Amino acid sequence: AFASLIERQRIRLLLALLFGACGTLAFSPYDVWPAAIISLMGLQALTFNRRPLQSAAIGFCWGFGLFGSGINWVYVSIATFGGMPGPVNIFLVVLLAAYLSLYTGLFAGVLSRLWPKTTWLRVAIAAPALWQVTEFLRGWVLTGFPWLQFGYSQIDGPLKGLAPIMGVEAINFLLMMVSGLLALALVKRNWRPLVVAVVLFALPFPLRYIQWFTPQPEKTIQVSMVQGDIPQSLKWDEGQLLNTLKIYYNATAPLMGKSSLIIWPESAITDLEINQQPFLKALDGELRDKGSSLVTGIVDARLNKQNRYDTYNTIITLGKGAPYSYESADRYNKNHLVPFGEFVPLESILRPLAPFFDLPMSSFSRGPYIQPPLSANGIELTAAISYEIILGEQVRDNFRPDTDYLLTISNDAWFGKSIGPWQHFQMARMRALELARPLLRSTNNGITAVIGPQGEIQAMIPQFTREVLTTNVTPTTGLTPYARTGNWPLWVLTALFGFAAVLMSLRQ
Ligand SMILES: CCCCCCCCCCCCCCCCCCCC(=O)O[C@H](COC(=O)CCCCCCCCCCCCCC)COP(=O)(O)OCCN
Secondary structure, three states: OHHHHOOOHHHHHHHHHHHHHHHHHHOOOOOOOHHHHHHHHHHHHOOOOOOHHHHHHHHHHHHHHHHOOOOOOHHHHHHOOOOOOHHHHHHHHHHHHHHHHHHHHHHHHHHHHHOOOOOHHHHHHHHHHHHHHHHHHHOOHHHOOOOOOHHHHOOOOHHHOOHHHHOHHHHHHHHHHHHHHHHHHHHOOOOHHHHHHHHHHHOOHHHHHOOOOEEOOOOOEEEEEEEOOOOOOOOOOHHHHHHHHHHHHHHHHHHOOOOOEEEOOOOOEEEEOOOOHHHHHHHHHHHHHHOOEEEEEEEEOOOOOOOOOOOEEEEEEEEOOOOOOOOOOOOOOOOOOOEOOOEOHHHOOHHHHOHHHOOOOOOOOOOOOOOOOEEEOOEEEEEOOHHHHHOHHHHHHHOOOOOOEEEEEEOHHHHOOOOHHHHHHHHHHHHHHHHOOOEEEEEOOOOOEEEOOOOOEEEEOOOOOOEEEEEEEOOEEOOOHHHHHOOHHHHHHHHHHHHHHHHHHHOO
């Protein structure tokens, strides 16, 4: 009796959660990319033949089914490092999933208000355009949080070659268009939208065999990222500062003279750069003598015009090809700070409330949006500290044509053994794919890997293990169409589809 059961409001809301939860089965840990299409079909099929205010509830439940069932490793960072009652920890995660679901409830509500009837216009020209706008708002409002975008799920899939041409957000655009036409063919029991939903999904397949980069087997350095595996509950303690420096230095010494580039995780030196001055100067001379360059994440307290200490999450460079100096330009201050982890809203009421809102060294300051690429031993590194690697447009803007490797240092020790480090790792692979540059990802204990110029994992060391990822990586030169253009060509298509769909909605 499913013919009349589907029309009930409650049955569609509960089906929204199941199709919403099926979305998380497309990301890095469970890499079933078909689950991205099935989940998106549920968002569009379940909102068919619904009033505008009823589709918003369905869209909210689909979002809550995806962002509370696939973004819940935030609970690990709350229940293990912030001191709060258990119900309070659950409430924040639920609130985060509820907040992120508004931009999906907004999508479905507007979609069923301007395009009530179910047709190819609603699913293929209206939904992809409105999905881009609502996804953009989720990634722009309150500093944004562009997590769980189905474009990242196609890192190893048919829609792989589309990212180098128009970016990851184009895969989000195409997945929504294909899924909508796929759900239209199922609800209306038609076959013409099914054929279109296959042609649009098979045309970008040959694009994955096009290489926009020319590899250079001449600058083949031997990079070696040192995974310190420093516990997060002890990383910023005073008594661990001497120990953590010894752990990294001892592993770095055999690498000197044989590894051209050595990379340490984010905030590897937990002390202020001005405080740890003699250690860096002594380390710089040893690295330069043997012919090795070190890239390190450190905390800085650079002075400002107002003579106020503005703490920055920086990257310093030492050794050959980049002499270390406190006034050197080979730095990278972190720009997009993580909310509630690096900055606290208004820093006035929330911080005294709970220890979670007052984390060790969580009063950072933003840096310039565009910064020069790091230079180390004659290679240009485009840095992106941790969270910044998920921001495709910010990385592209800093991406100079002379960049040899994409650099990313992260500290994923917060999110336990959960799927958070993997989802973050999958997004980092997308940057290498669309910019056609090798990605040298280094983490405290997370997934340390050398992503190839196509999103392939050239090397990786086991997680939660204090190891060193010594490997040979060949830099690539060449500009992808995404690097040369960016997000504007997609927004023209969004505006072209959005303006050609709103007018056809006001016509009737
Ligand atoms: C009406 C709406 C109001 C807000 C609704 C939301 C509800 C708020 C409460 C729920 C959200 C809580 C999020 C807590 C995240 C804490 C984990 C951050 C730890 C961290 O920053 O580590 C850094 C690594 O970056 C990373 O590894 C980044 C990993 C990916 C981001 C993690 C999740 C971010 C969630 C952002 C939520 C934004 C909501 C609004 C859009 C570097 O760490 P370090 O070693 O340098 O040490 C520095 C410690 N100070």
